[PDB]
Amino acid sequence: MKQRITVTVDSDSYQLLKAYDVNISGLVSTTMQNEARRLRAERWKVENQEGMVEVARFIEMNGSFADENKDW
Amino acid sequence: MKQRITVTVDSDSYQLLKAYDVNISGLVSTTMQNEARRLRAERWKVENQEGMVEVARFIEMNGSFADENKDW
DNA sequence: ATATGTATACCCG
DNA sequence: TCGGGTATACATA
């Protein structure tokens, strides 16, 4: 099924990743497999890959808030 | 005010992380800072679907004949 | 009809 | 609204 995982960041370092163009959908799930298998920490070598990607993120858009109480 | 970031995933390895004991909250956004700091380039996920097909056809073509004349 | 992201009432404090 | 994380409700693609 579809499980909505929500990491209420605003602190750790979420806004940047998506600020560039990756609202963790593929990131989390990717990190997940790695963190899932190894669950601790790993190490690799030089990227050995060219970085030719742009931005212009345009998918995520929402947000609201209206104070009218406090809750008891 | 914090910020809710949610990957509507489940089986994309996400569940496995929290399945252990970490809803990834701290991991996700932390990890992001790493990919947000380094942001080299996303790994374009390629497919593997074929696009070939056959035909093989052979019907027939039959016809009739006529007599006629002129009649005197 | 999904896929994806998000807000929000709730929970305890 | 209070928040992590939730579902659903809702927005958006």
Side-chain angles (χ1 to χ4, degrees):
Chain A
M1 234 327 251
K2 298 280 99 87
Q3 175 64 29
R4 188 203 78 280
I5 120 178
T6 117
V7 26
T8 54
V9 194
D10 163 76
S11 272
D12 265 83
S13 270
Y14 142 84
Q15 311 91 276
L16 236 164
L17 228 288
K18 63 148 210 156
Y20 85 57
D21 245 304
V22 169
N23 347 278
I24 14 79
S25 228
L27 209 207
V28 155
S29 48
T30 287
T31 251
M32 289 289 189
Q33 111 149 44
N34 291 343
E35 279 282 290
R37 250 301 146 81
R38 235 262 149 151
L39 230 204
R40 43 219 55 191
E42 288 98 89
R43 84 297 175 276
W44 348 273
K45 293 292 137 256
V46 293
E47 40 270 86
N48 224 109
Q49 307 274 264
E50 268 161 274
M52 201 65 252
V53 189
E54 53 239 79
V55 192
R57 81 91 183 81
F58 220 99
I59 315 178
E60 165 246 322
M61 257 303 95
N62 211 299
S64 202
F65 236 119
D67 205 315
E68 200 69 274
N69 48 77
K70 164 264 241 157
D71 209 308
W72 224 104
Chain B
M1 180 173 108
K2 281 278 160 251
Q3 167 144 18
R4 225 163 242 76
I5 97 165
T6 136
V7 17
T8 20
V9 68
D10 160 75
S11 298
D12 219 0
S13 282
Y14 139 76
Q15 298 253 108
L16 249 198
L17 244 289
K18 55 154 206 195
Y20 305 152
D21 70 314
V22 68
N23 270 303
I24 55 62
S25 84
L27 165 90
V28 169
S29 19
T30 264
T31 314
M32 296 160 123
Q33 125 93 230
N34 226 318
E35 220 46 67
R37 246 275 142 67
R38 306 205 139 74
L39 348 77
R40 143 248 292 105
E42 172 65 64
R43 290 240 284 170
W44 273 33
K45 284 122 215 89
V46 76
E47 227 251 70
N48 244 234
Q49 58 166 253
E50 233 270 75
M52 247 179 292
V53 76
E54 236 260 57
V55 178
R57 248 82 203 111
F58 40 23
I59 322 179
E60 237 271 65
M61 50 256 118
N62 280 252
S64 74
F65 240 66
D67 257 47
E68 229 234 87
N69 178 20
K70 195 267 125 244
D71 231 88
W72 202 298

